[PDB]
Amino acid sequence: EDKNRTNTDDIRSLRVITAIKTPYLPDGRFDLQAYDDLVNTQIENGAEGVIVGGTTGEGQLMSWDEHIMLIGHTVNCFGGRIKVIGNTGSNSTREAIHATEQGFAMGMHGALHINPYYGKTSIEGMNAHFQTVLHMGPTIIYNVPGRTCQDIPPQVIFKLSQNPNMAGVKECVGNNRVEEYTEKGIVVWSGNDDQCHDSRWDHGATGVISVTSNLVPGLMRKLMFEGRNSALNAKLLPLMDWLFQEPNPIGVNTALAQLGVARPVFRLPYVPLPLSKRIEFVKLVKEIGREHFVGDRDVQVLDDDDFILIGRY
Amino acid sequence: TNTDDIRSLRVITAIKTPYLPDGRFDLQAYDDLVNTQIENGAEGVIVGGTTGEGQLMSWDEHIMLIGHTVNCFGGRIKVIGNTGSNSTREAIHATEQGFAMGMHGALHINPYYGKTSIEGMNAHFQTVLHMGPTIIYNVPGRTCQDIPPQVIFKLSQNPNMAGVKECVGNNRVEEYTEKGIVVWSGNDDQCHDSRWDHGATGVISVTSNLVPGLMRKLMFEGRNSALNAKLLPLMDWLFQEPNPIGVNTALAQLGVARPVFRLPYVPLPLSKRIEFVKLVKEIGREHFVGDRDVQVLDDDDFILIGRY
Amino acid sequence: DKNRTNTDDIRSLRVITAIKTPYLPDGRFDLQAYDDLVNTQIENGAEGVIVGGTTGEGQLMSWDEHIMLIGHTVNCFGGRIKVIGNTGSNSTREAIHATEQGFAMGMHGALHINPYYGKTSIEGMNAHFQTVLHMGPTIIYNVPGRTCQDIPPQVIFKLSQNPNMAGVKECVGNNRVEEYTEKGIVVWSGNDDQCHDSRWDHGATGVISVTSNLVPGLMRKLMFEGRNSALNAKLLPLMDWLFQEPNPIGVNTALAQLGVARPVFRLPYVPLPLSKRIEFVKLVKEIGREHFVGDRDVQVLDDDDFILIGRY
Amino acid sequence: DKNRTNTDDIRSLRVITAIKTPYLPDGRFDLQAYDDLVNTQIENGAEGVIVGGTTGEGQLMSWDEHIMLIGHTVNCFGGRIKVIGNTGSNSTREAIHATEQGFAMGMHGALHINPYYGKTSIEGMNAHFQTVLHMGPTIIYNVPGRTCQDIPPQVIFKLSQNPNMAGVKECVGNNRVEEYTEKGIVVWSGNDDQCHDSRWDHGATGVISVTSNLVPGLMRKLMFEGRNSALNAKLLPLMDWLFQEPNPIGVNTALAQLGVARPVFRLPYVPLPLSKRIEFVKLVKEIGREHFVGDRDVQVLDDDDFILIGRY
Ligand SMILES: N[C@@H](CCCC[NH3+])C(=O)O
Ligand SMILES: N[C@@H](CCCC[NH3+])C(=O)O
Ligand SMILES: N[C@@H](CCCC[NH3+])C(=O)O
Ligand SMILES: N[C@@H](CCCC[NH3+])C(=O)O
Ligand code: NA
Ligand code: NA
Ligand code: NA
Ligand code: NA
């Protein structure tokens, strides 16, 4: 219980957690060299944790053997330099139990657990689901009703918070929901890049589980550590708007290809933003400055035929 | 003529998947449920739909259950595999295996949780539309993404697009049927009006799991607002928690499925099970599946399984 | 009485083809090519098929592929041929699961090998078979050259007490065949070059055959029309060619040369070399092309026609 | 340079334990029991562990169990012992995926058997091994008693051209061991009852051991402190008892009797009978309980203490 306590507190103290993009080879297999370069770039620019195969990491498109491999690989290669949080959540309790116990057995520092999506359940069912995995180790509960189509209500979060393994909540409902939890001492990470500044400084959020940190990790570190900076927050808004004009991770996948740090390979059902938006992206990089974005290569527009779409991989 | 056989079906049951106490499929109980559907005029079955808890299956057990259903019943009923996924890879592999097992058609949802652009949604459906007769499934209450009319009209030009399982409501159903697209209502409490007022071919039904004879009557024997009003309390009871919590609880009370739930589903509470006994008596037990007297059951009768 | 006839339906089969699983260029199943192979077997008097046996590369399938191929075969051909799923495993857990799923697909029977690589005690071997023998008609497969463990007579005799034990696919030789057939146990020879003598001199019911993949008509003649030392001697050069490397290397090469399977190998199998493919053209000319499956002129094929897949 | 160092780090190991995988009463892995077994090996001078080898029942594992156990062993013990994953398979697809996943998760080496049951040609064996050898330090496993196919010297000589081929786990005997060691190829004996003479008289580097599961200190002494024919002779009755039925039946029974694993077997393995367990208690007394793993007095155990799992 003393080790469990320290383990949970080591997650609660994290302010910058990157929902890391999973890059691919031309045949659709994981590009582990590109992935390792992405994680090293996050560490060098002050990311304190990584979600492995989150929504941004396309965990939804992995086989369990790929997903478990990427968790174990990240622990083995980077576990001493960053906290590794496996997205071992599922709409199936059986899948969540097996994936979470395997992830913890291979040394991941915490688990991200969404409520069941598509196959939505009752409040009693939601509690039953979370109770099967909460005992296994430090857990972040993920409320994203725009994707799950089911709000995790405060009554569920308050009951789960009775368990010392509940590290906190990745909250997407907004700053009023954030404040309801943080005023009661529950740790909250904003899941909304365009709200995380106000969440952090005005509503008691500990930090952010970020998509945008994939592109500008240094600026997101600054936003979470160095106090209110409404000017920097305003300067990042056009980039955050561009990143979410189509569902995540279409934007981050397109951007990382343009910056030359991931191959222009998409696993279906994702397809890149079209030419006009890629031209907009080069303009956004020029306005902020290329030096703030990951990678060293000059940003490219890329041609339509540079992109590879993989269904069977 | 494969696709035209699907297009003529008016009663398609989203069949419940029953379990043994260790959480494995109860294939004996499953066969008994499908046989009862065939005897009471069900014309098709969705295997591992939302009601069938496909979302809780391994692909191993989902494709097995499709193959089992084709072997046992394929000559007596149209077998539509729910081979859809939020992952294009999973949808491709499940659909080609389902068609290889001999299923008559596929049900395909738009990607849920990992939602995509219109262009990505089109790309997803195109990987599976060429494999055989396909019903497109629109349920924005569960996917949190409406398949817009623009997409359905474009998909409907593909001769393998049988039609739409539509859950938006009767205005959406009518927008499609008036433009010659075949529509099954996905909403039991709307399907009567859908069928008789809005050009729906029929229903892909949860309630037919409980009262298959009454649902066939509702789709075939003409407009009957009195029979429809008679079923509304039962339909309201079945959807007070998300499907399939209601049907799982009801089939346990009727004795045709064991009171075994795969998590994250748990039964309706005692007060609702007491109300179910009253709903059965009001409609008449003879109209519900099974021969056993309806039991309330104790909370401690229900087995909740996470590890199966 | 209901189960008795299902097992008796298997016991009466004389020609069971261990059917080859053909592939498309990236290593996925070629179901069109497979269906054509099975139809050819039926048309030429094969009475059963083993789905994903040693010849069918069941050892290279995932269980989802293997159970799909069984269900596909039952649905498409189950009324025209007896479908025996190779649902055996060196893991009891895998054998139980695969056998249950196979019978749920409607397969007529199961083929069960003793545990290979992870060999066990006589008591362990009996425990293994007892978990699956109750599920339906079962053929017990003894192939000590592959398993490195003989299923001894004492085990076959104990298994024989269960009515679901249809018989034995025996590879030890015609002396072991006779030890069983003289006690009323049904035996299929698993050795194409012994099956004639097994059938006519040692009371074997018939063969579970590799060679029937190429010349199903001639293997049917061999098992049905009586003693024919001339026909048996005529087939021996083809049988020697098919088993010069471990099965199914020969049959995979031959079916590609005859144009009824694509020249796609799942590793760790690779084709016979050009010298053997030239010999095969000569063997076909000597027997006559009309006796071999397919209508295309037999080809040698270039080394570069053969696609070797690891990531299947 | 890092690859040369990683390979040399495997080549220097003299005592590698083929660690037993212990189970909970329902058949799932007992990770608490496993962690205690690995700790005991480290404390008594084991330098490497095979995860899910023949002894570890890799043959009865699902891949998710097998990969988890490799990743768990690296995470908990990888700084204190070399972790060699048994990521081999008779299927090249299984071997490729398991091996790349095991190396991605930080295993130090891979153990690769030639394809068993589905045996292939020499050319096929080479093609199989070439798909995995480039992925990291590799021990080639020759056990013709289980595979029913000798990996011939020409295959080992060819693989030894690759800087990732660490060496050979050889079971054919001391003549084959010497054909490799005389050329500077690293060999571990796979035969506990030969490994003493193999180490001191035939140039073997050490042993990949079953017996080290029971007496790790005595096996370390045998591999490091020079010829000791007396100690080797003192161990022979124990080694004879451990292999009277196929491994791991003996080690599974012994570890239950020493109280360091539950008396739980995955089929098709079943324990040695009562008379053999009585013989074990006598063997432990003659050698001395202090040399065997665990602190608890050795127990005979009753027949009904043992649990046999089919659906694990
Ligand atoms: N596509 C499925 C399976 C993903 C499994 C690996 N995370 C889902 O989103 O639930
Ligand atoms: N739970 C996953 C996998 C189900 C796969 C079998 N239908 C999902 O809902 O996407
Ligand atoms: N390669 C494994 C798995 C095959 C499973 C499908 N038959 C074996 O030969 O046991
Ligand atoms: N029982 C199969 C599969 C084992 C997979 C895990 N090592 C075999 O021995 O090949
Ligand atoms: Na995430
Ligand atoms: Na459905
Ligand atoms: Na066979
Ligand atoms: Na080993």
- DSSP assignments along D166-199, one per residue: EEEEE-S-HHHHHHHHTTT--EEES-HHHHHHHH
B11: β partners: B203
The rounded distance, in Å, linking the Cα atoms of C50 and A82 is: 53
D65: β partners: none
The rounded distance, in Å, linking the Cα atoms of B90 and B130 is: 16
Place of tokens 């070439």: D130
Give which of D36, D17, D76 is closest to D208, Cα–Cα.
D17
Give which of B46, B253, B247 is closest to B137, Cα–Cα.
B46
Give me the numbers of helices (H) and strands (E) for chain C, helices first please.
13, 10
Give the E-state strand segments of C143-258 in sequence order. 165-170, 186-189, 206-209
Angle at A90 between CA B272 and CA B236, to 5 degrees: 25
Rg (CA), chain D: 18
- In-domain check, residue D207: yes
Contact by Cβ (8 Å): C96, D311: yes
Q: How far is the CA of B103 from the centre of ligand 6 (A)?
A: 15
Contacts by residues A253-257 (CB-CB < 8 Å, ≥ 24 positions apart): A253/A21, A254/A278, A254/A281, A255/A214, A255/A215, A255/A281, A256/A21, A256/A23, A256/A38, A256/A214, A256/A215, A256/A294, A257/A302, A257/A306, A257/A307
Say whether the peptide bond before residue D268 is cis (omega within 30 degrees of 0): yes
Q: Residue C55 annotated as binding?
A: yes
- In-domain check, residue C136: yes
Which of B64, B90, B99, B131 to mutate to test binding with chain C, by most C CBs within 10 Å of its CB? B64
The rounded distance, in Å, linking the Cα atoms of A177 and D153 is: 70
Q: Phi first, then psi: what are they for C186, rounded to 5°?
A: -70, 135
Nearest CA in chain B to A92: B56
Distance from chain centroid for Cα B245: 13
Residue D16 region, left (φ>0) first, then alpha (ψ -120 to 50), else beta? beta
The rounded distance, in Å, linking the Cα atoms of B31 and B24 is: 15
Which two three-digit tokens encode residue B157? 């030009």
- In-domain check, residue D247: no
Place of tokens 């009195």: B226
Q: How far is the CA of C40 from the centre of ligand 6 (A)?
A: 39
DSSP character string of B98-136: HHHHT-SEEEEEPPPSS---HHHHHHHHHHHHTTS-EEE
Q: Give the resolution to one decimal, in Å.
A: 1.8
Q: Could you tell me which residues of chain B have a Cβ less than 8 Å from any Cβ in chain C? A: 27, 59-60, 63-64, 67-68, 70-72, 74, 97, 100-102
DSSP character string of D264-310: EEETT--PPPHHHHHHHHHHHHHH-GGGSSSSSPP----GGG-EEES
- Distance (Å) of CA C147 to CA A73, C86, C117, C267: 36, 15, 7, 20
Angle at A141 between CA A138 and CA A145, to 5 degrees: 165
Indicate the helix (H) or strand (E) that contains C220: helix C216-224
Q: Could you tell me which residues of chain D have a Cβ less than 8 Å from any Cβ in chain C? A: 54, 57, 59-60, 90-93, 96, 113, 115-121, 123-125, 127-128, 131, 144-148, 245-246, 249, 266-270, 308-312
Which amino acid is it at D227? R
Q: Which subunits sit against A, judged by 3+ Cβ pairs under 8 A? A: B, D
Which two three-digit tokens encode residue B185? 């209502």
**Which among C60, C97, C131 is the nearest to D91, CB-wise?**
C60
Does the CB atom of residue D247 touch ligand 4 within 6 A?
A: no
The rounded distance, in Å, linking the Cα atoms of C103 and D262 is: 34
Q: Do the Cβ atoms of D92 and C266 come within 8 Å?
A: yes
| Eight-class DSSP state of B239 | T
Could you tell me which residues come within 8 angstroms of residue C72 by beta carbon, excluding any fewer than 6 positions away? B100, B101, B102, C31, C34
Rg (CA), chain B: 18
B109: β partners: B137
Does the CB atom of residue C115 touch ligand 3 within 6 A?
A: no
Which two three-digit tokens encode residue A93? 């309790």
Nearest CA in chain C to B58: C64
Q: What's the gap in Å between the CA of C149 and the closest CA on chain B?
A: 31
- At residue C26, the 3 state secondary structure works out as coil
Which two three-digit tokens encode residue A229? 């900076």
- Distance (Å) of CA B300 to CA B18, B240, B270, C162: 18, 22, 11, 40
DSSP character string of C48-106: EEEETSTTTTGGGS-HHHHHHHHHHHHHHHTTTSEEEEE---SSHHHHHHHHHHHHHTT
Q: Phi first, then psi: what are they for B157, rounded to 5°?
A: -70, -20
Give me the numbers of helices (H) and strands (E) for chain D, helices first please.
13, 10
Q: What is the number of other CB atoms lying within 10 angstroms of the CB of residue D226? A: 8
Which two three-digit tokens encode residue D20? 């037993």
The rounded distance, in Å, linking the Cα atoms of D156 and D206 is: 18
Give which of A249, A162, A240, A238 is closest to A208, Cα–Cα.
A240
Q: Quick check: is C141 catalytic?
A: yes
Axis-axis angle for helices D122-133, D92-104 (nearest 10): 20
**Which among D74, D97, D106 is the nearest to A65, CB-wise?**
D97
- In-domain check, residue C283: no
The rounded distance, in Å, linking the Cα atoms of C209 and A310 is: 41
In CATH, what number is assigned to the domain containing residue C78? 3.20.20.70
- In-domain check, residue D288: no
Give which of D142, D52, D56 is closest to D98, Cα–Cα.
D52
- Distance (Å) of CA D175 to CA A111, C127, D158, D197, D236: 53, 38, 19, 11, 21
Q: Residue B204 annotated as binding?
A: yes
- In-domain check, residue A158: yes
Atom number, ligand 4, closest to the C-alpha of residue D89: 10
Atom number, ligand 3, closest to the C-alpha of residue C90: 10
The rounded distance, in Å, linking the Cα atoms of C20 and C266 is: 12
Which two three-digit tokens encode residue B76? 């007596």
| Eight-class DSSP state of A30 | B
Which two three-digit tokens encode residue D108? 């130090």
Contact by Cβ (8 Å): C71, B71: yes
A143: β partners: A171
- At residue C147, the 3 state secondary structure works out as helix
Q: Do the Cβ atoms of A268 and B115 come within 8 Å?
A: no
The rounded distance, in Å, linking the Cα atoms of B6 and D295 is: 69
Q: Phi first, then psi: what are they for B114, rounded to 5°?
A: -85, 65
Handedness of CA A177, A178, A180, A181 (dihedral sign): positive
The rounded distance, in Å, linking the Cα atoms of C61 and D285 is: 49
- In-domain check, residue C280: no
Q: How far is the CA of D210 from the centre of ligand 8 (A)?
A: 8
| Eight-class DSSP state of C245 | S
- For chain C, the straight-line distance linking the first and the last C-alpha, in angstroms and rounded, comes to 44
Contact by Cβ (8 Å): D62, D94: no
The rounded distance, in Å, linking the Cα atoms of A78 and B65 is: 42
Q: Which one of the listed residues D23, D82, D169, D269 is annotated catalytic?
A: D169
Which two three-digit tokens encode residue B162? 């049988």
The rounded distance, in Å, linking the Cα atoms of B109 and B82 is: 9
Q: Could you tell me which residues of chain B have a Cβ less than 8 Å from any Cβ in chain A? A: 23, 50, 53, 55-56, 86-89, 92-93, 109, 111-117, 119-121, 123-124, 127, 140-144, 241-242, 245, 262-266, 269, 304, 306-308
D83: β partners: D49
Distance from chain centroid for Cα A235: 22
D170: β partners: D142, D189
Contact by Cβ (8 Å): A311, B92: yes
The rounded distance, in Å, linking the Cα atoms of D34 and D22 is: 6
The rounded distance, in Å, linking the Cα atoms of B172 and B186 is: 12
Give residue D213's domain range.
Answer: 2-225
- The residue whose C-alpha atom lies closest to atom 9 belonging to ligand 2 is B55
- In-domain check, residue D106: yes
| Eight-class DSSP state of A68 | H
The rounded distance, in Å, linking the Cα atoms of C28 and C68 is: 13
Place of tokens 């309801």: A180
Give the E-state strand segments of D24-92 in sequence order. 48-51, 82-85
Which two three-digit tokens encode residue A60? 């939804």
The number of domains in chain B is 1
Cα torsion for A73, A79, A82, A86, to the nearest 10°? 60
Burial zone of B239 (CB within 10 Å; 0-12 exposed, 13-18 middle, 19+ buried): middle
Q: Quick check: is D169 catalytic?
A: yes
Nearest CA in chain D to A100: D68
Axis-axis angle for helices D174-181, D192-201 (nearest 10): 40
The rounded distance, in Å, linking the Cα atoms of C305 and C223 is: 36
The rounded distance, in Å, linking the Cα atoms of A249 and D44 is: 51
Contact by Cβ (8 Å): D140, D168: yes
